[PDB]
Write a protein that binds this ligand. Structure first.
Ligand SMILES: [Cl-]
Length: 162
């Protein structure tokens, strides 16, 4: 298992524009387009992203190209953010993947906000960070996915994704 596969499980794949769990315009493998309610704007963000007149449909290849760039940016947000780097650097390989998952999903900024949880991870205090992580809107809105990320952090294995 790896970051791509993991993320592919959590996000799915859709070749036509769709609304995410929060009602925002998305496409591909969890590629958010816009937070605006206009389908127009979304179409526009898409065309711009793809470099072509898409009509709200893309190919598999295109989906994957966006996914790649997305995973690459999330990694980099992990290394780049000042609250993040240190935690990231203290983690094992699996757990790093758990962190990136979160960055992809909620932005660098969303994650940098889970202060207490971040310190606990950094301290390698697994059971506590897991409880703490669970007291969140994140957890309450998307409980199954959150559970997955959470066990990953708890255990440091891929069991939740098997
Ligand atoms: Cl883009």
């Amino acid at each position: 298992m790896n970051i791509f596969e993991m993320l592919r499980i959590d996000e799915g794949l859709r070749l036509k524009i769709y609304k995410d769990t929060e009602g925002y315009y998305t496409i591909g493998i969890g590629h958010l387009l816009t937070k605006s309610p206009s389908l127009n704007a979304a179409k526009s963000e898409l065309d711009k992203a793809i470099g072509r007149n898409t009509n709200g449909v893309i190919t598999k290849d295109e989906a994957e190209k966006l996914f790649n760039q997305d995973v690459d940016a999330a990694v980099r947000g992990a290394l780049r953010n000042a609250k993040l780097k240190p935690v990231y650097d203290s983690l094992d390989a699996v757990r790093r993947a758990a962190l990136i998952n979160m960055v992809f999903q909620m932005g660098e900024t969303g994650v940098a906000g889970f202060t207490n949880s971040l310190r606990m991870l950094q301290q390698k205090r697994w059971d506590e960070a897991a409880v703490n992580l669970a007291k969140s809107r994140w957890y309450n809105q998307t409980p199954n996915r959150a559970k997955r990320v959470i066990t990953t952090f708890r255990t440091g294995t891929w069991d939740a994704y098997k």
